[PDB]
């Protein structure tokens, strides 16, 4: 069976809401195993404490850089980076929780949740997992974010572990 | 009122124009990787005497989205094309971007300037003759630059204004 993992979001400190995700160990084992480690926190770093740095109302939510909190960091559970393990499955719409890189074989820590269909990025970004509860938590950060990503208050992951 | 410039950085992913831009404007660089959306600024500074305000505009290098520039490309007045003198990828990638702003403004006359950064680094690929005689046969200024040591910023900037100027006067 696949696992869950939440992330409980706040703003400026404040609690926002919960979301959780299925993350897809049957089709991108190793993907989905490092995001749900990091979201335990169980290899001593994580994304506990760590911020959604870049926002773009229309498009999607990235966060995951919890070693420089800038959107310049970030590690795998792996290494520094690790492969791209497949292209299967694809951004077919809000919701999709895809690997953030720096181009080929480069994927860290970062992650982005989209908010609408990104077919541009298929083949390109690694797609693991789906938003399953809290899908409006998602919805309501985006009017923290701008076009160029920049947000005018602090989204943070107060709290995030398995289910 | 002094008069705005309206500057456009333009160039191939991790060639420095992010590194450039923040040197001009904060006098610091880091080492960090921070691919840009995109992101502008205001500098007030002395050129040849005369105040006046830069707005740079810090664009992607994302190779991915090379349709989504004619706007910015029909706003800006003048272009700072740059690439890395040790990635010579980046060097055949300038011509592509000059094409595009030649096209999109429809004129041969459009100000810019030629920006070979990264000259701090051993690992130099591109030799300054084959970038001084890309730029002759653009009719344009080349310039060398480092964002890490500051050398040559403030003339690569300044040069574009320059050019700008003697633009505006035609
Ligand atoms: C042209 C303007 N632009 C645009 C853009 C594109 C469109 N359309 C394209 C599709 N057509 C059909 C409709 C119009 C419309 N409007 C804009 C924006 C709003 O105009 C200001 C994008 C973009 C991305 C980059 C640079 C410029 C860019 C960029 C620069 S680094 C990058 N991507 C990839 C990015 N790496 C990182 O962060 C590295 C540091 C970590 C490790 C990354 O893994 N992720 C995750 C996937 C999403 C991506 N970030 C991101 O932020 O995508 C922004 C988005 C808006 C989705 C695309
Ligand atoms: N040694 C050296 N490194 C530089 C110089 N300019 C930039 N860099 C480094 O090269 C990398 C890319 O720089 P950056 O300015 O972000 O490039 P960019 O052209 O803005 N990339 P993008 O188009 O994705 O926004 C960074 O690691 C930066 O520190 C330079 O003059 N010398
Ligand atoms: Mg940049």
Not at chain 1, 13 to 31: H, I, M, N, Q, Y
Not at chain 1, 81 to 96: M, Q, R, S, V, Y
Not at chain 2, 148 to 165: C, H, M, N, P, S
Request: net charge negative; proline share 3%.
């Amino acid at each position: 069976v696949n696992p869950t993992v939440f992330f409980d979001i706040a703003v400026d400190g404040e609690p926002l809401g919960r979301v959780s995700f299925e993350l897809f160990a049957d089709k991108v084992p190793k993907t989905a195993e490092n995001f749900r480690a990091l979201s335990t926190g169980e290899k001593g770093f994580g994304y506990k404490g760590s911020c959604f740095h870049r926002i773009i109302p229309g498009f999607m939510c990235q966060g995951g850089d919890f070693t420089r909190h800038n959107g310049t960091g970030g590690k795998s559970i792996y290494g520094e980076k690790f492969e791209d393990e497949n292209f299967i499955l694809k951004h077919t719409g809000p919701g999709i929780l895809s690997m953030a890189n720096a181009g080929p074989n480069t994927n860290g820590s970062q992650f982005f949740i989209c908010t609408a269909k990104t077919e541009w990025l298929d083949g390109k970004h690694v797609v693991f997992g789906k938003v399953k509860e809290g899908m409006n938590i998602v919805e309501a950060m985006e009017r923290f974010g701008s076009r160029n990503g920049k947000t005018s208050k602090k989204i943070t992951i107060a709290d995030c572990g398995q289910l | 009122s002094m008069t705005e410039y309206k500057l456009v950085v333009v160039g191939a992913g991790d060639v420095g124009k992010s590194a450039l831009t923040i040197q001009l404007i904060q006098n610091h660089f880091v080492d960090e990787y921070d691919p840009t959306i995109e992101d502008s600024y205001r500098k007030q500074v002395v050129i040849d005497g005369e105040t006046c305000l830069l707005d740079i505009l810090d664009t992607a290098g994302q190779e991915e989205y090379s349709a989504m520039r004619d706007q910015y490309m029909r706003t800006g007045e003048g272009f700072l094309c740059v690439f890395a003198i040790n990635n010579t990828k980046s060097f055949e990638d300038i011509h592509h971007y000059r094409e595009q702003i030649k096209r999109v403004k429809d004129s041969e006359d459009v100000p810019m300037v030629l920006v070979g950064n990264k000259c701090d680094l051993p690992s130099r690929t591109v030799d300054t003759k084959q970038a001084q005689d890309l730029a002759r046969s653009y009719g344009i200024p080349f310039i060398e630059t480092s964002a890490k040591t500051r050398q040559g910023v403030d003339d690569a900037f300044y040069t574009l204004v320059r050019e700008i100027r003697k633009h505006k006067e035609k």
